[PDB]
Structures are given as structure tokens and as C-alpha cells.
Amino acid sequence: GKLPPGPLPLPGLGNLLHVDFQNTPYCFDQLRRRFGDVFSLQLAWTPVVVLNGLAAVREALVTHGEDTADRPPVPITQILGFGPRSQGVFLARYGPAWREQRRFSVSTLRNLGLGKKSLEQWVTEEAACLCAAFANHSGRPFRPNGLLDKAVSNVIASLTCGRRFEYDDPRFLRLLDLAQEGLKEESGFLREVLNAVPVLLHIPALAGKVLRFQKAFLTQLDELLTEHRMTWDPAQPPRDLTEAFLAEMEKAKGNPESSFNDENLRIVVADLFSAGMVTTSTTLAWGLLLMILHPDVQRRVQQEIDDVIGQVRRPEMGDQAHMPYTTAVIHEVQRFGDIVPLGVTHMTSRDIEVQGFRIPKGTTLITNLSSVLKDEAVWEKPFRFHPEHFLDAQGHFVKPEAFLPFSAGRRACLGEPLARMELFLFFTSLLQHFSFSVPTGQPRPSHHGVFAFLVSPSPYELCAVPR
Ligand code: HEM
Ligand SMILES: C[C@@]1(c2cc(CNC3(C(F)(F)F)CC3)c(F)cc2F)CCSC(N)=N1
Numbered sequence: 390g391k392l393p394p395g396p397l398p399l400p401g402l403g404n405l406l407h408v409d410f411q412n413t414p415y416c417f418d419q420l421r422r423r424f425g426d427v428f429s430l431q432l433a434w435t436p437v438v439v440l441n442g443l444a445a446v447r448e449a450l451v452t453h454g455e456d457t458a459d460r461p462p463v464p465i466t467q468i469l470g471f472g473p474r475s476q477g478v479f480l481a482r483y484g485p486a487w488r489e490q491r492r493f494s495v496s497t498l499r500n501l502g503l504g505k506k507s508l509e510q511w512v513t514e515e516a517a518c519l520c521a522a523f524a525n526h527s528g529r530p531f532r533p534n535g536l537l538d539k540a541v542s543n544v545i546a547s548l549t550c551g552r553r554f555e556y557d558d559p560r561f562l563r564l565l566d567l568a569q570e571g572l573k574e575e576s577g578f579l580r581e582v583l584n585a586v587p588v589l590l591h592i593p594a595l596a597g598k599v600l601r602f603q604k605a606f607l608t609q610l611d612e613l614l615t616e617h618r619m620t621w622d623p624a625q626p627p628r629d630l631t632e633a634f635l636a637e638m639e640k641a642k643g644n645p646e647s648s649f650n651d652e653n654l655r656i657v658v659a660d661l662f663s664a665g666m667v668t669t670s671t672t673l674a675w676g677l678l679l680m681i682l683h684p685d686v687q688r689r690v691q692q693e694i695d696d697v698i699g700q701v702r703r704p705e706m707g708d709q710a711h712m713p714y715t716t717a718v719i720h721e722v723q724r725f726g727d728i729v730p731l732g733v734t735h736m737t738s739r740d741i742e743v744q745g746f747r748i749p750k751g752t753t754l755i756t757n758l759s760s761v762l763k764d765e766a767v768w769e770k771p772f773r774f775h776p777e778h779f780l781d782a783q784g785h786f787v788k789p790e791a792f793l794p795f796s797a798g799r800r801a802c803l804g805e806p807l808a809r810m811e812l813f814l815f816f817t818s819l820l821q822h823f824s825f826s827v828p829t830g831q832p833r834p835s836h837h838g839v840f841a842f843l844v845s846p847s848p849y850e851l852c853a854v855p856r
């Protein structure tokens with residue numbers, strides 16, 4: 390069939406000069422309005438096809454989900470300990486190694502939450518700690534980001550290692566600091582060039598600098614896992630995912646086909662830890678920013694909170710079904726926030742057909758989630774913070790098909806159920822006890838975010854006054 394259209398491919402750099410790599414989603418909106426919803430790019434040695442709009446994204450990730458659930462090879466991860474039967478979940482190639490870890494994580498999240506509401510309990514308790522840390526800042530403006538990271542990080546640690554850390558814990562702070570630096574290393578120009586040719590990593594000097602913060606994070610994580618292995622009681626049902634992983638590792642002794650080994654444990658845990666730490670935190674940061682930029686929205690949420698929950702009783706997941714406006718606001722935060730504009734890259738394991746065009750096997754697919762969440766043909770006013778995007782005239786919550794912040798298909802975010810819980814419980818608990826506003830004397834903060842692989846809000850301070 391016909392290959393998708395696109396700008397002129399230069400002999401050497403290809404289409405490297407047609408992309409600014411800063412505000413890339415803005416550049417893709419220009420290419421979409423010039424070549425259509427499915428266009429092509431030649432980024433160096435890599436053939437890339439960009440998918441825009443709900444239809445093009447669904448056609449690849451759902452209709453041809455079997456052929457688009459693979460990941461582009463990342464050779465430099467071998468420094469971190471990545472192997473054939475130890476690829477984790479996030480970067481894992483499409484196959485038995487991914488599916489076993491995928492099915493394990495999805496089911497374990499489900500089991501730890503349905504049995505004794507341990508999922509909901511750790512979040513509820515962490516929200517209370519978050520409220521207290523907010524309370525100590527009262528009377529003075531502050532950046533809420535750091536505290537959001539800690540509260541979000543603790544929820545994960547509660548699911549991985551069955552514990553939380555105090556906000557002033559030296560090892561906790563270091564773990565969080567190393568994590569954020571490790572995100573920046575994955576957004577480096579040096580990475581792409583090093584991803585191209587592996588034997589460049591044979592140079593001792595180069596190999597060391599590649600992932601110095603990321604190796605520090607794993608090392609720090611190893612120390613914590615070793616401690617957790619000591620306190621684990623195999624005679625009891627698993628308290629957390631790591632224990633459940635350890636119990637599987639024992640059963641899989643003598644089986645070289647299993648992905649339940651030591652090398653994969655530290656990688657799967659590092660995956661779950663990082664992925665659900667910077668995403669959920671950033672969203673909560675967006676949520677607070679939008680509440681001080683739109684106080685009228687904040688009051689209506691606080692109104693619905695009182696009419697359903699009160700101001701003393703802690704919020705529960707059962708309350709969400711009775712709070713349609715608050716649900717709309719949270720969904721609109723994710724939509725407007727749009728923290729993962731280009732999603733996570735996929736790769737075709739076969740030849741497929743998207744929107745008539747043909748996509749060769751081994752092609753790197755980019756799902757422009759931004760083009761879906763901001764689609765002007767779907768949303769009433771896509772470039773505004775508008776809670777009524779998820780409400781009808783009567784006030785009922787509706788969820789459009791175009792709400793895809795967690796992407797779609799087999800590779801869709803496995804953390805979504807937990808994310809939904811963290812977002813509702815943290816957001817409601819904060820607004821239940823605090824009124825947020827812009828600090829007087831300071832400029833109105835921009836609703837525009839700083840573009841990266843993960844779009845965070847422009848740096849801002851806020852005032853949190855108790856109620
Ligand atoms: C607001 C919160 C979150 C958002 C918006 C988000 C978004 C995403 C997106 C766009 C993807 C890529 C899906 C694809 O490749 O098609 C993804 C994958 C993933 N996310 Fe999330 N995520 C969030 C929270 C979390 C949490 C809380 C966890 C874990 C507890 C998590 C763990 C993962 C993992 C492991 C994957 C890879 C799944 C796979 O490759 O099969 N994320 N997420
Ligand atoms: C972007 C992401 C990510 C990675 C790290 C780095 N984690 C490491 C990893 F690269 F090994 F995964 C050092 C331990 C973060 F800190 C934050 C992230 F969102 C998502 C989780 S798994 C992955 N490969 N990349």
C-alpha cells in the first residue's frame with residue numbers, strides 16, 4: 390500500500406531539521422494540518438509514523454493491537470541489568486517475558502485492593518499525612534510539588550515494599566532526588582546517539598556517564614529490597630507486590646523460562662516505582678494549579694464535598710459515584726494537563742494498515758495522545774479548563790471516548806486503577822480541608838506547561854488556608 394505522507398527527507402539527518410524537539414507536540418499539530426492524521430518522519434536511522442486523533446490511535450492500538458504492542462529496542466539498558474528473561478514491564482519487548490509480568494502486576498494490584506482495602510487504606514492514610522504537611526506551611530506560600538512527590542511515592546512503596554517513609558527520611562529524599570534526575574537522563578540527546586550503536590558503550594569512560602543517576606537509583610533501591618527480603622514472612626499471604634513476586638520466585642526455581650528472578654525483581658519494582666511516582670504527582674500538581682487559577686471551580690468541588698462527605702469524615706472510593714462534578718474536574722485536570730502528550734513509543738511487530746496507509750514491520754509508532762485530548766472536533770473548548778467536558782446539562786458525569794490519558798490497547802497503563810484512586814482521594818482530601826489561592830503580590834501563574842517527555846506545570850507557589 391501507500392506509505393504515509395510527510396516533509397522532505399534530507400539525505401543525512403532526514404527530518405531532524407523539521408522538528409524543533411522543544412514543543413514537539415506543537416510542531417506535530419502543524420504537520421497534522423499539512424499531511425493529515427497519519428504522517429511519516431525519518432529521525433536518523435529510525436522510521437517513525439505519528440498517529441493523530443482517536444480513530445488513528447484506536448486503529449493501531451486496538452484493531453491491530455496484536456501487531457503494535459511491542460517496544461523499540463533500548464540496548465543501553467543492558468548496563469542496568471536488562472536481559473531476555475528480565476526486561477521488566479515498561480520497556481519489555483512483546484512476548485512471554487512482558488505478558489507474565491504484565492499479568493502479574495495487574496492481578497496483584499487487584500488482589501491487594503479487593504481483599505482488605507489495603508490499596509485504599511494506604512492512600513487514605515497517606516492523604517492525612519499530606520494534609521498535615523500542608524498544614525505546617527499555613528501562613529506562608531510554598532511550592533506544593535515536593536510534598537506531592539513524597540505522598541505519591543509512599544503509595545507506591547506501600548504496594549511494592551509494604552511500607553511508607555517519613556517526609557524527612559534521608560534515604561527517602563535521596564531516592565526521590567535520584568529518581569527525578571534519572572528521568573532527565575532518559576530525556577538526553579546523548580541517549581538517542583548511544584541507543585543507535587551499542588559498542589559505543591564498550592568505552593569505559595562513556596559507559597559510566599550514560600546512566601550515572603539511574604544506576605544510583607537502582608543501587609539505592611537494591612539496598613531497600615535487601616532489607617525487605619529480610620523481614621518477609623513466607624508463611625503468611627503476601628503483604629505487598631514484592632512479597633508476591635518473591636513467592637513466585639521460589640516456585641520458579643529450576644525454571645529458566647520464568648521471568649521471576651532476582652534480576653527482574655529490581656527492574657519490575659523500579660518500573661512500578663518510577664512510572665507511578667512522577668505521573669501521579671505531576672497530575673496532582675496540575676490539579677492544584679488549576680484550582681487557584683479557577684477558584685469558582687474550587688468552590689463547587691468543596692460544595693459537593695460537604696454535601697456528600699462533610700469536613701470531618703475521610704473520603705472513600707464509594708463516594709466518587711455520588712460526586713459527579715468532582716469526578717468531572719479531576720478528569721478535566723488530566724485532559725487539560727495532558728502530561729504525556731506523545732505517550733510512550735510503540736513498534737510494529739508486523740505489517741499493518743492504518744487509515745488506508747501501510748506501516749512496515751519494525752516501524753516506531755508515536756501515539757499523539759495530545760491530539761486526542763485536545764481534539765477540536767470532539768471537545769467543546771479543548772484549550773480551556775472546562776469541567777463541563779465531562780458533564781451533561783443535568784449534571785451527570787459522562788466520559789467521552791476521546792479521554793485517553795492512559796493510552797489504549799494491550800500496553801495501556803496498568804496503573805490506571807491505582808491512579809484513579811490516588812487522584813480522587815488526594816484531591817478531595819486536600820480540598821476538603823484547604824482553600825487554595827494565588828499568593829498576593831505574585832503574578833498569575835501560566836497555565837502553559839514546560840514540555841518534556843512528561844509535561845509538568847510551570848513553577849508556581851500557592852497559599853493553603855485551613856477551613
Ligand atoms: C496520572 C497517572 C498516569 C498516567 C497519565 C499514565 C500514563 C501512561 C501511559 C500513556 C502509558 C503508555 C501506554 C502505552 O504504551 O500505550 C503508561 C504505561 C504504563 N504505566 Fe502509567 N500512567 C499513570 C500512572 C501510573 C501508575 C500509578 C503506575 C503503576 C503503579 C503506572 C505504571 C505503568 C506501566 C508499568 C506502564 C507500562 C505498561 C506496559 O508496557 O504494558 N503508571 N502509563
Ligand atoms: C519514563 C520511565 C521512567 C524511568 C525512570 C528511571 N528508572 C530507572 C530505570 F531506568 F531503570 F527504569 C533507573 C531505575 C524514572 F526515574 C522515571 C520514569 F518515568 C517510565 C518508567 S520505566 C522507564 N523505562 N522509563
Ligand SMILES: [Zn+2]
Nearest residue numbers: 550551628629
Ligand atoms: Zn513486605
Ligand SMILES: [Zn+2]
Nearest residue numbers: 781783784785
Ligand atoms: Zn444525564
